[PDB]
């Protein structure tokens, strides 16, 4: 049956033109692609695993589109936040994310990135308690994480290191996926209290009593006041070798830094891009705080880089670092959406019809995207480009023998007359 696909997308358009909000179209496009992603994936010829991934990718694209256009377009402007110098850093961070839409967009994108991150299954047969092997062998004169750092790592049993590896890797995957609550649960429950505690430093300080404008979200002070310190402390910890590469990786991510080579070598376009947007973000916040004298000089223990990249440049670098992946045609759209250069790319792939015909999803996707765009933002895509796109896709509806559902797509030109 699967050669139904176009129906689903077409179907969604029917429903829209007929209850005469348009963001639902895309939401459905997403779900549609995802549903199809499942079909080709389950039981299939290994020629299908490929086009299955091109559907999952499809789906992620629709999601990213929804998220960003919702934020950008459903922008109806709220009330400005008036801080005082007595206010906590927490509030200033919030203010920053409110006022600077460019940067919040980075947040949105990171959220999307996390959403679609793979995490291993929870490690089984985890041991009763930490470093149990070393303790049992005798030779841990101190039971604290820093003991084998104070003096040769030869202290820790091999099996203990192997388990610490399992743990820190799992925690790392969870952190990259946004699963911070799960990471704290794992830390707690796996007898890694001190690491847990480390994960608690992630929050900026708020006090509901002082920072009135969040006395709703909070009933109790929380987060840590000397955060610039925390951050250097963690970063330095991240640079100290004789720690497991995933642990160092974790601290890197937390300090707004770029994890060690041993770990980073396995990160893909999404993972890598995520890492570097995290860096942009971290740097930008800490700079925002410095420009408002909410950082205390004592805390500038160490040099961290102060110069934030632009999303443009991060993308360019990550691209050159992952050319194969970068060049994949829906991930180009992903980037195009991220930079807003989107009608830009529409008109572009339009002129590539004048090695876009070779891949099937593309001509469809661009067309339905163009439709959505001009629905949500009348004017968005050049009238001509709509004409050209629908023209060509329609002729494929003909080549597929689905003339049945051509009128729906017609509802965008007087050129429709000619059908």
């Amino acid at each position: 049956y699967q050669t139904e696909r176009f129906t689903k997308f077409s179907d969604t358009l029917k429903e829209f033109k007929i209850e005469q909000d348009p963001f639902n179209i895309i939401r459905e496009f997403r779900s549609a692609a995802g549903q199809l992603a499942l079909d080709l994936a389950n039981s299939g010829d290994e020629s299908n695993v490929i086009s299955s991934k091109d559907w999952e990718l499809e789906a992620r694209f629709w999601h990213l589109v929804e998220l960003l256009l919702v934020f950008r377009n459903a922008d109806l402007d709220l009330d400005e936040m008036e801080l005082h110098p007595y206010n906590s850093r927490g509030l200033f961070e919030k203010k920053l994310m409110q006022d600077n839409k460019q940067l919040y967009q980075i947040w949105i994108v990171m959220v999307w990135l996390k959403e679609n991150t793979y995490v291993m299954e929870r490690p089984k047969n985890v041991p009763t308690s930490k470093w149990l092997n070393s303790i049992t062998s005798g030779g841990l004169k101190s039971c604290d994480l820093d003991f084998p750092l104070r003096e040769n790592t030869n202290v820790l049993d091999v099996k203990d290191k192997e388990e610490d590896h399992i743990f820190f890797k799992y925690i790392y995957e969870l952190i990259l996926a946004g699963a911070i609550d799960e990471a704290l649960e794992e830390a707690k429950l796996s007898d890694n209290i001190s690491i847990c505690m480390i994960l608690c430093g992630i929050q900026e300080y708020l006090n509901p009593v002082i920072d009135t404008q969040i006395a709703n979200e909070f009933n109790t002070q929380q987060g840590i006041k000397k955060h610039s310190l925390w951050r250097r402390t963690v970063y330095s910890l991240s640079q100290q070798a004789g720690l497991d590469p995933y642990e160092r990786a974790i601290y890197s991510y937390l300090s707004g830094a770029i994890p060690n080579q041993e770990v980073l070598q396995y990160s893909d376009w999404e993972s890598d891009l995520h890492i570097h947007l995290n860096q942009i973000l971290q740097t930008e916040i800490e700079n925002y705080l410095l420009e408002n004298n909410q950082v205390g000089t004592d805390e500038l223990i160490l040099p961290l880089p102060s110069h934030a990249l632009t999303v443009q440049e991060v993308l360019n670098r990550v691209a050159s670092r992952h050319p194969s992946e970068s060049e994949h045609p829906i991930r180009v759209l992903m980037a195009s959406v991220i930079l807003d250069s989107l009608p830009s790319v529409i008109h572009s792939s339009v002129e590539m019809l004048l090695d876009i015909i070779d891949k099937p999803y593309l001509l469809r996707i661009v067309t339905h995207l163009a439709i959505c765009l001009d629905i949500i933002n009348p004017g968005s895509v050049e009238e001509v480009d709509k004409s050209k796109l629908i023209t060509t896709y329609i002729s494929l509806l003909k080549l597929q023998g689905l003339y049945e559902n051509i009128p729906i797509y017609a509802t965008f030109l007087n050129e429709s007359d000619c059908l």
Binding site: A241, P245, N260, Q261, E262, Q265
Partner: protein, 274 residues
Amino acid sequence: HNELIHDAVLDYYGKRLATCSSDKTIKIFEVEGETHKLIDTLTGHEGPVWRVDWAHPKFGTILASCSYDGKVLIWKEENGRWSQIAVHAVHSASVNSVQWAPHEYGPLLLVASSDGKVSVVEFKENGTTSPIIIDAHAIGVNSASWAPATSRKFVTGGADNLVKIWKYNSDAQTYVLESTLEGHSDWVRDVAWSPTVLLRSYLASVSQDRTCIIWTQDNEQGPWKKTLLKEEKFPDVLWRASWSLSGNVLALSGGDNKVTLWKENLEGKWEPAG
């Protein structure tokens, strides 16, 4: 007066020679066939300058020298006037070898001192040094040569008669030892990696016991192959062992006042040439 120069190096284009002797001075010459005109003398060491070595001209005019005073001194010509721009002496004994990496690696340096250490000194954005050192050999290191490649590696010749092959690792951030090789009965004086991007890799390991073993590895997998160049001790202790770029010729500087030359033949074994 120059009765005993210990090392000399030629630049990429071979216009400027840099000898270094025992009186601590490093003399720079403008060579032109018969006539090498002395252009400079460089005094900044507290002991015999054992070795000198130009860097890739991609990095301007830089020359890292190592001397008996335990200190590596980086020099640089500046508008026709030399100046010691940096120094790296994190070694508690006489520094023996100093050899730059392939210019694709950055501006990396390879120091090898008698305190059983070998460092790789990066020169950052401020031009300042970024030392990441390793312990190489027990009783001391006489030499350390770089490897070209396209997964970086180098070789080290020891005072415990070992010949070690180290490789970079992003997990460790320090060069992880990957293979050691045993075949000499005395201080491994010099070790050389061959610049031949050919079917196999060649190593000529000269030593004090008047041998020169040649470690020919088949490829990336199968370990090395021991081959005593010739099976008779040379009339005197051997010092230096250098490969040729074009050709894979081997030059051997024995303490017997001539330099011999050995070429591989279709037997796989090595034959004199000259």
